[PDB]
Structure formats: structure tokens, C-alpha cells
Ligand binder design. Structure first.
Ligand SMILES: [Mg+2]
Ligand SMILES: [Mg+2]
Ligand SMILES: [Mg+2]
Ligand SMILES: [Mg+2]
Ligand SMILES: [Mg+2]
Ligand SMILES: [Mg+2]
Ligand SMILES: [Mg+2]
Ligand SMILES: [Mg+2]
Ligand SMILES: [Mg+2]
Ligand SMILES: [Mg+2]
Ligand SMILES: [Mg+2]
Ligand SMILES: [Mg+2]
Ligand SMILES: [Mg+2]
Ligand SMILES: [Mg+2]
Ligand SMILES: [Mg+2]
Ligand SMILES: [Mg+2]
Ligand SMILES: [Mg+2]
Ligand SMILES: [Mg+2]
Ligand SMILES: [Mg+2]
Ligand SMILES: [Mg+2]
Ligand SMILES: [Mg+2]
Ligand SMILES: [Mg+2]
Ligand SMILES: [Mg+2]
Ligand SMILES: [Mg+2]
Ligand SMILES: [Mg+2]
Ligand SMILES: [Mg+2]
Ligand SMILES: [Mg+2]
Ligand SMILES: [Mg+2]
Ligand SMILES: [Mg+2]
Ligand SMILES: [Mg+2]
Ligand SMILES: [Mg+2]
Ligand SMILES: [Mg+2]
Ligand SMILES: [Mg+2]
Ligand SMILES: [Mg+2]
Ligand SMILES: [Mg+2]
Ligand SMILES: [Mg+2]
Ligand SMILES: [Mg+2]
Ligand SMILES: [Mg+2]
Ligand SMILES: [Mg+2]
Ligand SMILES: [Mg+2]
Ligand SMILES: [Mg+2]
Ligand SMILES: [Zn+2]
Lengths: 99, 144, 159, 56, 118, 142
RNA sequence: GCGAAACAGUACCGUGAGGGAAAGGUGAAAAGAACCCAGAGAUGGGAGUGAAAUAGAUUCUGAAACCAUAUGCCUACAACGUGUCAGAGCACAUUAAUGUGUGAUGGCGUGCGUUUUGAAGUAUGAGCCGGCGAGUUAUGAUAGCAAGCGUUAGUUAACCA
RNA sequence: UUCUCGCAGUCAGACAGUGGGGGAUAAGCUUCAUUGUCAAGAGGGGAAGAGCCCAGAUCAUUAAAUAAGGUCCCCAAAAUA
RNA sequence: UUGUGGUAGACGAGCGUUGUAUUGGAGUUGAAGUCAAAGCGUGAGCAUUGGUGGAUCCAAUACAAGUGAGAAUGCCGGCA
């Protein structure tokens, strides 16, 4: 019913048919990925990580986050540097919980 | 990216409580009163929604101050004029106005805020066993 | 410049005790009257020097790449005077040769008059002597008609 | 004395908030019907039932 | 060749003005005050990204600490028991469990309480 | 259906005219005339003339009922100024700014006239978005 | 750009020598708005001419500061470099995008240039907006890079066509 | 960090620890030697602080372990004897 | 694999404006200008649509500069 997965470095609590956003995974939209690291599943929680517990997910999109403008400025010191960041993400939805 | 946590959307599970300060220390009573008023002890704490329960304090004149603080520690209030600094000893506060003393002690343990006004409002402090607050059906808990 | 512009060489206001800022003239660069600090001048050179052998080498490679290519046909005196001085005949010649849109350049050694009478109302095509063509005129051509004796003079000039 | 800081366009309107005008009380003449400001002679010189001035 | 400035100054100025949209009065109208506010707002945004990472951790710690005190256990010992039992779960997900799934959160506390470490 | 009347370079200042214009906005025709005829202000015998002309060209030119007209908006926009030199003391001088106002009065017959203005604004926005979508379809077509 | 695109060395300043501005654009064609209504009139609203009158003599385009009107959101126990990160509720629907407008409330937060060991500064400079406003040219020297020509090399200056 | 060539900027420094001179074992004083920081360096502690302590900011993450410092409330985190 | 705080300063790589030369292209079925919008870039910056506007403008490769405005009790005009 619920699981604690570790995609990238973050931990997500996921239900059935739940769409959450993780860091870029380098996978085309439409494929069927299998998340490996699972912490808690149902009621049996493994200490380091559960063995053979897999979370089957489908990748929906590979969009980018909102633009972030980093403007570093040293007051009265002739230093105004500007930079932009658009962090890529990937959205994926849970399909089935492997036993 | 990640999943955001749940925060209460102006949900009011607030309830009424009763405590008896028969022999409770001023500071030891005030710390738990502030925790109860702020709702910090609640499982779900959203710090912009004042999710904290009301509290009524009985027997304010019966509280105690340890040591020689009843005659050596002074409470100070200054008006905006010159010389308007009024001083009251611990014993005088414990006799003349004990409700104000407990009220001020609880207020001092709260963050400078625009919600702290409402938080200190939800403290009903009485100097006697009687109280006009029995229509709220407040539950009774000790040493809180 | 600041000195050349007609204006008052006096101080408009006093140096001190006036609420206004210090000023020294009414025709300063930061004034609306206008004294241009540096500005363009009519004494600039704009000229560059290139060695004689370097120019010969540039002309050598440009002739090499332009020659032995398409639209580099050979021409003689007969059609240089068969034009009759009428540009209609030369328009037909360019139409027959399919060189209408090309910027064909005639390279001529004897300065024929009938060919020069024509091709003068044509902003596209042009005719030059061997001692008059340069690198730029050669590679702007996109097509050229070279006389046989012009070609004989070309090997001689290169040496 | 003069302002060391310029007053914005918001403080100006806050001060002018009390500069609004009031509508003077008006009534109807009892012989011709046109509106006249209260407690004053109308345009016909007829105040109540008394002919005050000659007609305009 | 007198190059004249036009559409160059105005475009780069209107960019700063567009960024400073929603400010108080002249802070969105004049280019100079708008530019200063955008730079200051960028500094604030930079500093608060770091501070968000720390403040949300503190909130999770507070919620988790409260959820434990109802059961008689403290935060300082709960994390120690988690480490000895090898269980690796964020305080974020643990707090999310205690707010959304009380029964399963109670299951985790029960195992860390008494079961043999490893 | 808004009828309107205008007056350029009115000698009254906009500051001293807005005070009188706010006494007639939203008022009925007859009541607005009655209010403006008995107010002891300079900018009262000029707004009255503009109002009367606007009523005339509303019930004659545009064909309105005449018993449903209300003052929709009466404003005094800023007009061109005139600069003069007032001689001060000790040889100094200041600049007197003679202020003028562009007066405009507008009356309507429909008490819901603001809705149509918002509707026209919405229509302009919709046409912009519709053009963008049509351009996107063309882009995908190629 | 000549100070001067217009009737500019004019208006204007000074006893005088002298100093010295600003200001261009209707429309293809005046066809420059007959006539009606309100008004004392200018003028405005219709009509008419015109492709266009929101091109109307205020006459190409019309920016910002500035002044007013209004849909939507918020604001009268509130300590504020006015923003930022979270965040309810309200109102909409887009360069379809984990959307947009406002922001009850919580955490954090003393501007920009200058010159100084050190400026939130009780040091300094700017009321705001727009335009203009400060590393050039000529002749030589050195060094880096690159090309042409080369071991009795290399290259012309003036001048002539 | 040695040698050769091109282009510089710098010649007003400040404080803390340590050894001294002048001063009175006064100075946030003045003049030296040496170790560091600031100048030209944010973050955390010191309630607030250029120079003290922990350290060195490429950007994003509502992930985890720690340094100085701390765990009644403000304000994250403790219990035994 | 080692790195990426930074003033004075040294070095390298680029953006943008006006014009000229070669190529191609758009424009009264609407160019420049100009306003608005919920776009794209690491940065100077670059697009799309709609309104207004009424005749020029754009892309590539080179070349030449009166080539980049927030400050000078800066000049001029307008407005608080
Ligand atoms: Mg000039
Ligand atoms: Mg206002
Ligand atoms: Mg007043
Ligand atoms: Mg400029
Ligand atoms: Mg006099
Ligand atoms: Mg005279
Ligand atoms: Mg008209
Ligand atoms: Mg005008
Ligand atoms: Mg115009
Ligand atoms: Mg209120
Ligand atoms: Mg109060
Ligand atoms: Mg305070
Ligand atoms: Mg606050
Ligand atoms: Mg805030
Ligand atoms: Mg503050
Ligand atoms: Mg600067
Ligand atoms: Mg100084
Ligand atoms: Mg000093
Ligand atoms: Mg101050
Ligand atoms: Mg001073
Ligand atoms: Mg100075
Ligand atoms: Mg000043
Ligand atoms: Mg300026
Ligand atoms: Mg050289
Ligand atoms: Mg020294
Ligand atoms: Mg010294
Ligand atoms: Mg020392
Ligand atoms: Mg000593
Ligand atoms: Mg000493
Ligand atoms: Mg000293
Ligand atoms: Mg310095
Ligand atoms: Mg520091
Ligand atoms: Mg600190
Ligand atoms: Mg680093
Ligand atoms: Mg730890
Ligand atoms: Mg420790
Ligand atoms: Mg705590
Ligand atoms: Mg660097
Ligand atoms: Mg160009
Ligand atoms: Mg356009
Ligand atoms: Mg310049
Ligand atoms: Zn009467």
C-alpha cells in the first residue's frame, strides 16, 4: 500500500498510482523503470534496505524546474556576477509494487 | 525534487483544559503552560496556525517562589513618564495581584510575534477556585 | 573639438558659493552646446601596405582558382567587334551563354571601343584591362571571359 | 525647516483623505419647484409665503 | 559614424523593471530603485535556499520529537536506537509517517524499542 | 452605451476640480444637476456646462432615454501648463506654473456598463492567445 | 550638423566692448468639417469629405517619470532598507506550464556608488524620468602573434601614369 | 618559490596571541620581531561585533554524518549517578 | 584525477549598436518604431503572438568605429 523508496538521495513515501518528481534518471519517456532501493514495504521494514522489493514506475516527462537567477554581489566592491540555473527533473508514477 | 510535507490549513482542533496551581513553581508551571498554548507538544505542529489548546489556571495565589525570592526579587513596570517605574516584591505580587504575575511569566516565555498576542489571550488565569469558564467543559490535567 | 566650437571662453558662474556645480565653459563635452572630445578627423589615413611579392602571390592563387573552372571561357576580337556597339546584341549573347545573372568580367588587352560602348548600361557586367583588374574584381566575377592574348600576357606577367 | 526626506505619493493622499467635500442640504421651493439650498430665499424671491425680491 | 543609443538602454532597463514587479511604489517604477531591490532580493533568495534546508530539518526534528514524547521515548535515544538497528530513514519521511500513517510509524518505534540490535 | 463631452485647457486646476467631480459620480441626471447648481465653488459653473452639453448630445445624437442617464465617470485630467517668472526678493526669481485641466464627463444608460469594458479587455486577451495557438499549429505543421 | 534647417547674430542680457538661445513633419489631394444639438462664445457631440478623423490645424510615430478611473486580492492591536523562503483563503485561466493575480500568518533580513585599516552611517554623491556625457588620432620605439620573401637577403620614400 | 622576457598594482594598514622598546606593567596609544584573521572572505558560536574560536561559498536538493558551541521556554537537541 | 571566495591587477573567450562590401530573403495580404503577455538561453542577450504604426528591414561571412550610461553639488527638457 505504501513504500519508502530512495531515488537519487531523497526518500519518498509512495502509494499506488502516485506521481512524484525525482532527479534526472537518463531514461526515455514511456519506459518501465524498476526502482531498487526500498526501505519499508507494507509492514516488513528491512534495516539497511529490503531485499527483492522493487517499485515499478513509468516515466511521464523530463521537464526542467523554474529558472533560478543567482546574482552574487559584493557591495561597494565592483563585483556583480549573474548566473542562471534550470535544474532538470523527471516525473514518474507508481504502477505496481513487486512482492 | 521531492514530496512536500503536510501542513494544517487553518484547522482548529483546539480544546479546553483545566490545571490547578496549588503548589506549582512559577517557572515550572509557566514553561508547560507556554508549551500547551503554542501546541508545540502536538504531533502536527504548523508554526503559523496557532494550533494550541486553551488553558485555565486555578489557585494563582497559592503558587510558590523558592528561596528568598519572595523578598529579594522585584518585578518592574515603567510608564512612559519619568519616575513611573513601579516595583513590587515577590511577596507583594503573590498577595496583591497573583494572576498578573502568572500572566506576565507565561508571556515572557513566548516569541516576539504577531501570533503571540492570540497565544497569551488563550490563557485564562484566576486567583480563586471559582471560575466563570465552566460552560466550556474543560478537561482536567495535573501539573501542566 | 572643445576649442573649435564657437562659444564663450569665460566661466559662466563663479567657482564657489553658488549652489550649482563647478563649470568652466558653456561648450564642454558634457554640455548641450557640444564640444566633441575625440571625434572623427579628416586627417586619418585608412591606408594599408602590402608587399609587392605578397600581392603577386595573392594574384597568382586567385588566377589559379578562378581559371580552369566553369564560366572561364576564352574570347577573341571577332565578337568584341561583332557586338556592333548595341547592347541588345550583347544581351542576346549573355542569354545564349547563360551568363545573365553572373557578374561576368571581360579582360581585354587592346581596349576595344565597340565592347566598351556596350556593357556600360549593364550594372552587372564590366570590362577591364589586364593592368586594371585586381584580386577583388577577379573573385567578384563569378564568371569571366578572357582574351587569348590577355592569357599570353598573363604568363609573362607572372614570371 | 524643510523635509530632509521626500514624501511619497502615498502619504500625500493619506493627508488629503480629509479634504473631501460635503453636499450642501437642498430643498424644493413651494411655489415653483426648483431646488434651492435650505433656509435661503429662492431664485423667484419667494421665501415661504412672503414675496421677498422681485422675480429674477 | 555617430552611433546613437536607442532600444539598447530601454530593453536592459525594462528587464530589471520586469523582475521588480510587485514592489512598493517607486521600487517598481524607477529603474534605479528596481535594480537595487532585485539585487537585494537575489541575495535574500540565495541565503534563504541554504536556510530553508536547515529550517525544514528543524521542523521535522520538532514534530518527530513530539510524536515520541507521547509514547515515553525521547528524540535523543530514538535516533540512537535507529542507528544500532541499522534502520536508515529520513526524519522527513518518519515525520510524514507519524502524521499520515500512525499505525506504521508505531510499528517502527516498537521494533527499535526492544528488538535485538542487529 | 456611453455618451460624453470634453473640454480642453480648462483654467481650473485638476487638484481643485477632482474635489467637485467626486460629488457627482454615480448620481442620477436631475440630482447631479441640482447638486452642482448650488455649490459655492469655481469649478461648479464649468462642470455644469459640460454636463449639460453631454446630456444634450446623449438624448439627441446617440438617442438615449433621458430618464436613465447617470454620471458614469467625471474626471479632470492634467492639461498643459504655462510657465511664468515671479520676481522674488534680493534679485532672485521663481517659476509660477499656471495649471490647466482637461475635463471629461461621461454618462451611461445601462447600470452594468463596467462589465462590457471588462468584456472588451477579455476579448483582446483571448485574440492574443488564439493567435499564439494558431502559430503553434503552423509550427508543428512544418 | 555652422551659434543659426523657421525672418539667427534674431528675441533677450549689458552704459559699452561683449555674451547669446529655443523652435521642422496634417493628408495623395484642404476635399480644413457646410448643416443639426448644448452653450454667451471658444469648444464639444453628431453629420459630411477622406482609405484612415483615436490622421482635425493641439495636426508623422508617441517611451518613461507624473496625474486620474476601474475588474480581482489585501489592509484600521500595528514596530516595517518594504524584500526573501514557507504558507491558508480568495479570484481567474496561460507563449499548458509541478499555471497566474493578491498575500491572513511563520522564519530570516541595517540600500547603491565613492573613499577608506574600518561606512547601515550621526562621512560623502544622486528628488524622479529621458536624451547627451570621459582611453582617440597623426608620427615613431619595443614586445607578442600571423603572413609574404630569403641566405650576396628583405623592402621602398618622394614623384610619374 | 630558480633563470629570461611582456604588463602591472602596491609605498595611509587594522586587530588578536606571544617577546620587548617609548608611556605610568594606562590607553581601541605609539614603534618593532613572529604566528593568524580582516583588508580582498560569506557560513556557524560569541545576544548584537571587519580582526576572537570553528572553517573556506561552482549551482540545485524540504537527503545523511560531524567541527567550534550547546540541549527548561524564547530556540534545534539529554539523560542517568 | 586535481580543482572553480575575491578588490587593485594580468590573461583568454564572447554579446550588443551604426554603417560599408559580398551573397540570399521578407515587406500596404503590412517593415521599422512602440506597448502587453503566464516564452528561450551560463551571461551579456534572443525570439512568438496580439494591439498601435504607416515604409523600409532581416540572416551569414568580413571590415571601420562619435559602439555599450546609475552616479561627475554632471548639461538640457519634462514632471513630482
Ligand atoms: Mg555642435
Ligand atoms: Mg494615488
Ligand atoms: Mg487636508
Ligand atoms: Mg545613452
Ligand atoms: Mg530689484
Ligand atoms: Mg539692448
Ligand atoms: Mg472629432
Ligand atoms: Mg501634447
Ligand atoms: Mg501625434
Ligand atoms: Mg486587524
Ligand atoms: Mg495588545
Ligand atoms: Mg523589536
Ligand atoms: Mg516581521
Ligand atoms: Mg515576512
Ligand atoms: Mg529590519
Ligand atoms: Mg560604477
Ligand atoms: Mg576619509
Ligand atoms: Mg579615517
Ligand atoms: Mg540612519
Ligand atoms: Mg560633514
Ligand atoms: Mg569628500
Ligand atoms: Mg545630497
Ligand atoms: Mg539622469
Ligand atoms: Mg610587430
Ligand atoms: Mg606595522
Ligand atoms: Mg606605521
Ligand atoms: Mg600587540
Ligand atoms: Mg611595553
Ligand atoms: Mg607594548
Ligand atoms: Mg592602533
Ligand atoms: Mg584598501
Ligand atoms: Mg566572517
Ligand atoms: Mg553571530
Ligand atoms: Mg571553493
Ligand atoms: Mg548527529
Ligand atoms: Mg561536541
Ligand atoms: Mg527545543
Ligand atoms: Mg574566480
Ligand atoms: Mg549590421
Ligand atoms: Mg509591431
Ligand atoms: Mg560614447
Ligand atoms: Zn421659487
Amino acid at each position: 500500500m505504501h513504500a519508502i523508496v530512495v531515488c537519487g538521495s531523497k526518500q519518498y513515501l509512495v502509494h499506488e498510482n502516485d506521481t512524484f518528481f525525482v532527479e534526472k534518471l537518463e531514461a526515455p519517456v514511456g519506459k518501465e523503470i524498476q526502482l531498487d532501493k526500498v526501505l519499508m514495504l507494507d509492514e516488513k521494514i528491512g534495516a539497511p534496505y529490503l531485499e527483492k522489493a522493487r517499485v515499478v514506475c513509468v516515466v511521464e516527462k523530463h521537464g526542467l524546474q523554474r529558472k533560478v537567477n543567482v546574482i552574487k554581489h559584493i557591495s561597494q566592491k565592483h563585483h556583480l556576477k549573474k548566473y542562471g540555473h534550470r535544474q532538470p527533473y523527471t516525473k514518474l508514477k507508481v504502477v505496481r509494487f513487486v512482492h | 525534487k521531492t514530496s512536500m510535507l503536510t501542513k494544517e490549513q487553518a484547522n482548529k482542533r483546539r480544546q479546553w483544559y483545566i490545571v490547578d496551581a496549588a503548589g506549582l513553581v512559577l517557572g515550572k508551571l509557566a514553561v508547560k503552560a507556554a508549551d500547551l498554548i503554542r501546541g508545540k507538544n502536538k504531533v502536527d505542529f504548523t508554526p503559523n496556525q496557532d494550533c494550541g489548546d486553551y488553558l485555565i489556571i486555578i489557585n494563582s495565589d497559592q503558587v510558590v517562589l523558592t528561596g528568598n525570592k519572595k523578598e529579594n526579587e522585584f518585578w518592574y513596570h515603567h510608564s512612559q513618564y519619568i519616575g513611573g517605574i513601579k516595583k513590587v516584591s515577590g511577596r507583594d505580587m503573590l498577595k496583591k495581584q497573583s494572576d498578573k504575575l502568572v500572566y506576565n511569566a507565561v508571556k515572557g516565555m513566548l516569541p516576539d510575534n504577531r501570533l503571540s498576542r492570540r497565544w497569551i489571550t488563550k490563557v485564562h488565569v484566576f486567583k480563586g477556585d471559582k471560575h466563570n469558564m465552566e460552560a466550556q467543559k474543560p478537561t482536567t490535567l495535573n501539573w501542566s | 573639438t572643445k576649442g573649435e566650437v564657437r562659444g564663450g571662453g569665460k566661466k559662466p558662474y563663479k567657482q564657489k558659493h553658488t549652489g550649482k556645480a563647478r563649470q568652466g565653459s558653456t561648450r564642454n563635452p558634457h554640455f548641450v552646446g557640444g564640444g566633441i572630445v575625440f571625434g572623427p578627423k579628416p586627417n586619418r589615413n585608412y591606408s594599408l601596405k602590402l608587399n609587392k611579392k605578397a600581392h603577386t602571390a595573392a594574384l597568382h592563387t586567385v588566377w589559379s582558382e578562378k581559371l580552369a573552372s566553369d564560366n572561364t571561357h576564352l574570347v577573341d576580337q571577332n565578337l568584341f567587334n561583332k557586338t556592333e556597339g548595341k547592347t541588345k546584341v550583347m544581351m542576346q549573347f549573355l542569354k545564349s551563354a547563360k551568363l545573365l545573372d553572373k557578374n561576368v568580367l571581360f579582360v581585354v588587352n587592346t581596349l576595344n571601343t565597340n565592347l566598351e560602348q556596350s556593357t556600360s548600361n549593364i550594372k552587372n557586367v564590366q570590362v577591364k584591362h589586364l593592368d586594371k583588374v585586381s584580386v577583388r574584381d577577379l573573385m567578384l566575377a563569378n564568371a569571366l571571359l578572357v582574351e587569348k592574348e590577355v592569357l599570353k600576357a598573363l604568363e609573362g606577367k607572372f614570371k | 525647516a524643510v523635509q530632509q526626506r521626500r514624501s511619497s505619493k502615498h502619504r500625500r493622499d493619506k493627508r488629503r483623505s480629509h479634504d473631501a467635500l460635503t453636499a450642501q442640504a437642498l430643498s424644493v421651493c413651494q411655489k415653483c419647484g426648483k431646488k434651492k439650498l435650505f433656509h435661503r430665499v429662492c431664485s423667484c424671491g419667494m421665501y415661504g409665503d412672503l414675496r421677498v425680491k422681485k422675480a429674477y | 559614424m555617430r552611433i546613437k543609443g536607442g532600444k539598447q538602454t530601454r530593453v536592459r532597463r525594462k528587464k530589471w523593471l520586469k523582475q521588480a514587479s510587485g514592489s512598493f511604489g517607486t521600487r517598481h517604477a524607477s529603474y534605479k530603485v528596481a535594480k537595487q531591490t532585485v539585487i537585494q532580493a537575489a541575495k535574500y533568495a540565495y541565503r534563504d535556499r541554504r536556510n530553508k534546508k536547515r529550517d525544514f530539518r528543524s521542523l521535522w526534528i520538532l514534530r518527530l520529537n513530539a510524536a515520541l514524547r507521547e509514547q515515553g521515548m525521547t528524540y535523543s535515544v530514538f535516533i540512537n536506537l535507529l542507528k544500532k538497528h541499522n534502520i536508515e530513514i529520513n526524519r522527513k519521511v518518519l515525520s510524514e509517517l507519524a502524521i499520515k500513517e500512525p499505525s506504521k510509524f508505531n510499528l517502527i518505534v516498537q521494533k527499535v524499542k526492544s528488538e535485538q540490535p542487529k | 452605451m456611453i455618451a460624453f463631452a470634453k473640454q480642453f485647457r480648462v483654467r481650473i486646476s485638476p487638484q481643485k476640480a477632482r474635489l467637485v467631480c467626486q460629488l457627482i459620480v454615480g448620481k442620477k441626471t436631475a440630482d447631479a444637476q441640482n447638486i452642482l447648481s448650488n455649490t459655492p465653488k469655481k469649478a461648479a459653473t464649468l462642470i455644469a456646462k459640460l454636463l449639460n452639453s453631454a446630456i444634450a448630445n446623449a438624448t439627441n445624437n446617440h438617442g438615449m432615454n433621458g430618464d436613465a442617464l447617470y454620471v458614469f465617470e467625471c474626471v479632470a485630467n492634467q492639461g498643459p501648463s504655462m510657465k511664468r517668472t515671479i520676481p522674488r526678493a534680493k534679485g532672485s526669481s521663481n517659476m509660477i506654473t499656471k495649471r490647466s485641466s482637461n475635463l471629461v464627463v461621461k454618462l451611461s444608460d445601462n447600470p452594468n456598463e463596467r462589465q462590457e469594458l471588462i468584456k472588451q479587455q477579455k476579448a483582446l486577451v483571448k485574440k492574443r492567445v488564439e493567435g499564439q495557438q494558431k502559430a503553434k499549429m503552423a509550427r508543428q505543421k512544418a
